[PDB]
């Protein structure tokens, strides 16, 4: 995240950190995600696309730091990894960039509620906040686009949703942004999501609840004027999510 403040997981208790194991001894951070129900986390397909080998990913909940432990954290394995059939990438956008990870602990359980682990709410069928609404994004992504390391402390910032008319303007992204995406930026292009924040949540309040309105998906540069961050429009995937998720 560029700008923003450093936080702790109590402030984003539904944030999931996804890492990959390497034959050699190291685990590296891959992307962020959000907990929907006790056994399912949602992220972006582009994070797995290149290495869809579920056995090699580890998911942690209750984590405020990237490579040091946080007390109360939970580690899980990915029992199922569902990528979107119809996922596409072009010279900028990712289409249908949503994925589901069903988690299983080494004891056979899903997430347990704590002060650092909570689920986030899903919107209702095609229901979104109005442009102007301030939403918060969270993650361990870069703090500057030129960095080549990620922060060790979790970050969060606030951006506002902008309309499709504004985002599809030729000097922004033109028709690379579709109806299944949402764009959010800082009025003064000072804070934004960036590489390493992929898969994480764009949370806004809708009808009284903190709702997962978008998933960090792509953007040109980071915190670049007239280059908003584009997020997957969760409200438009509800049928898809439903057809794959079940029980507690």
């Amino acid at each position: 995240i560029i700008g923003g403040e450093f936080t702790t997981i109590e402030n984003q208790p539904w944030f999931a950190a996804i890492y990959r194991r390497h034959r050699g001894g190291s685990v590296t951070y891959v992307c962020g995600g959000s907990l929907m129900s006790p056994c399912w986390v949602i992220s972006a397909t582009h994070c797995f696309i290149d290495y869809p080998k579920k056995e090699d990913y580890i998911v942690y909940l209750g984590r405020s730091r990237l490579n040091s432990n946080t007390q109360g954290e939970m580690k899980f394995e990915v029992e199922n990894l569902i990528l979107h059939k119809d996922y596409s990438a072009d010279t900028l956008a990712h289409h249908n960039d949503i994925a589901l990870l069903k988690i299983r602990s080494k004891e056979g359980r899903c997430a347990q509620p704590s002060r650092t682990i909570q689920t986030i709410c899903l919107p209702s069928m095609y229901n979104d906040p109005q442009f102007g609404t301030s939403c918060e994004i969270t993650g361990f992504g870069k703090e500057a686009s030129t960095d080549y390391l990620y922060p060790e402390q979790l970050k969060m910032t606030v951006v506002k949703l902008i309309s499709h008319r504004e985002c599809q303007q030729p000097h922004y992204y033109g028709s690379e942004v579709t109806t299944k995406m949402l764009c959010a930026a800082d009025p003064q292009w000072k804070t934004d999501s960036c590489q390493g924040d992929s898969g994480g949540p764009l949370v806004c309040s809708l009808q009284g609840r903190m709702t997962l309105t978008g998933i960090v998906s792509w953007g040109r540069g980071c915190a670049l004027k007239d280059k908003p961050g584009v997020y997957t429009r969760v409200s438009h995937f509800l049928p898809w999510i439903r057809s794959h998720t079940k029980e507690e």
């Binding site: 109590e10 539904w14 509620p113 909570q118 689920t119 986030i120 709410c121 949370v203 903190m210 709702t211």
Partner: peptide, 9 residues
Amino acid sequence: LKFQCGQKT
């Protein structure tokens, strides 16, 4: 206790 979506404590 149990999950309450969207609640920070």
